[PDB]
Design a protein around this ligand. Structure first.
Ligand SMILES: COc1c(C)cnc(Cn2ncc3c(Cl)nc(N)nc32)c1C
Length: 433
């Protein structure tokens, strides 16, 4: 029995509770978050845990800053069938009386599942008093000074009668592992440790190394191979982004987190569909799917840039990459409405050339460089193979021309090139006609 629990009845109230009413605002806010805010109730577990994390962080930040030693920082959950209750305690930083009397709105999600909510909290500030807070969700809550309150916050939820399911250990376990696996602080359920995965996307890219990226890749992609490509991308400049993107070793989606808290599974709009082969995670604080598209554009540009930069530091690895995933790139080009989205994506295309040795590939932009004068012509020919292409007469005029011609060997490459009628300021025309 390595049983580890901190949740116990140590709290007592000596005086009477003072009765308060929420302000005309908060009654609506509490009402709403219960009534319409969350699509499925279970997420209350998700919110409270998140709160429990934040508090803990704020404690750890304080102590470490003052050079003080660290106490046990933990999050504990307790289910009870006989009492029909679910409990969540964190020792983190607490709440002063002021804070209790008058993070966000996550807490109030608890009233999606509760007849009444009973809370005990203490601030980590020296010589702080503990307090009890009681609510029916009415508009009436109660505050009293409590004894036997541990530093941090203890929330006791008396589930309403159709929500006794969250009094079951198994159920709550499932919810926890679903949304809360990557919590930053040790999390216990009924005395047992329940979490172990590290939110490596939050780390400094220079601290994350291979074995970790490999583990995480296998987890998020549910795969047994390795990522051939890894992009660890962080920004505050446009929006808040902590992301990791993987390209699988094997030939043929992204999870949406916020603050290490699972928002969505198998999300389809974070990345453009032509990038649906990408695996990994995107974490952002700019979250509630009508307008998530800022992120989509930012990530599309960042990923295109990434691959373009991959083609330079390594030539043949990117050649195999284009061989195995060129499908999605052509598809993306033909799909995109605006022209230069087409062209951005077209910067990833690799084709053989009349100039280069048979077996080597070239991008379009490289093609722009070689041409001397005569802007407004890009020359291409599609044929069964390189040898066949070389013979063809129409090129022959080109061969004594001094102008390079690209070589395609599949109709989908030529169709792609025909759709993308123009690259940069130069037209893509076929040497025959
Ligand atoms: C019942 O009291 C409240 C009310 C009235 C509003 N919001 C919350 C959530 N909340 N707010 C601060 C805070 C801290 Cl420091 N730790 C933890 N775990 N939870 C927190 C509570 C607990």
């Amino acid at each position: 029995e390595p049983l580890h629990s901190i949740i116990s009845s140590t709290e007592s109230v000596q005086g009477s509770t003072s009765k308060h009413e929420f302000q005309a605002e908060t009654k609506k806010l509490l009402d709403i978050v219960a009534r319409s805010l969350y699509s499925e109730k279970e997420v209350f577990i998700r919110e409270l845990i998140s709160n429990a994390s934040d508090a803990l962080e704020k404690l750890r930040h304080k102590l470490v800053s003052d050079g003080q030693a660290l106490p046990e920082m933990e999050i504990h959950l307790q289910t009870n069938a006989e009492k029909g209750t679910i409990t969540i305690q964190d020792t983190g930083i607490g709440m002063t009386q002021e804070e209790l009397v008058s993070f966000g709105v996550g807490f109030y999600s608890a009233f999606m599942v509760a007849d009444r909510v009973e809370v005990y909290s203490r601030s980590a500030a020296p010589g702080s008093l503990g307090y009890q807070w009681l609510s029916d969700g009415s508009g009436v809550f109660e505050i009293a000074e409590a004894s036997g309150v541990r530093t941090g916050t203890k929330i006791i939820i008396h589930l309403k009668s159709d929500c006794k399911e969250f009094s079951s250990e198994a159920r709550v376990r499932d919810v926890v592992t679903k949304y809360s696996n990557f919590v930053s602080f040790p999390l216990y359920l009924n005395g047992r440790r329940m979490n172990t995965l590290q939110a490596i996307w939050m780390m400094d890219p220079k601290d994350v190394r291979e074995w970790q990226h490999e583990e995480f890749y296998r987890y998020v992609a549910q795969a047994h191979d390795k990522p051939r490509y890894t992009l660890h991308y962080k920004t505050d400049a446009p929006l808040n982004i902590r992301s990791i993107f993987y390209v699988p070793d094997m030939k043929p989606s992204v999870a949406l987190y916020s603050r290490k808290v699972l928002i969505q599974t198998k999300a389809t709009d974070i990345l453009p569909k032509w990038l649906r082969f990408i695996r990994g995670v995107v974490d952002s604080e700019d979250i509630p799917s009508a307008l998530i598209r800022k992120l989509r554009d930012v990530l599309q540009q960042r990923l295109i840039k990434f691959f373009i930069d991959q083609s330079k530091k390594d030539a043949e690895k990117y050649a195999k990459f284009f061989e195995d995933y060129g499908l999605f790139m052509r598809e993306g080009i033909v799909t995109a409405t605006e022209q230069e989205v087409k062209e951005d994506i077209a910067k990833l295309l690799r084709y053989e050339s009349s100039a280069l040795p048979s077996g080597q590939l070239t991008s379009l932009s490289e093609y722009a460089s070689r041409m001397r004068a005569g802007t407004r012509n890009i020359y291409y020919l599609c044929a069964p193979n390189r040898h066949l292409a070389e013979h063809s007469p129409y090129y022959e005029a080109m061969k004594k021309k001094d102008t390079e011609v690209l070589f395609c060997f599949e109709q989908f490459d030529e169709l792609t090139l025909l759709h993308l009628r123009e690259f940069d300021k130069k037209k893509l025309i076929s040497v025959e006609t």
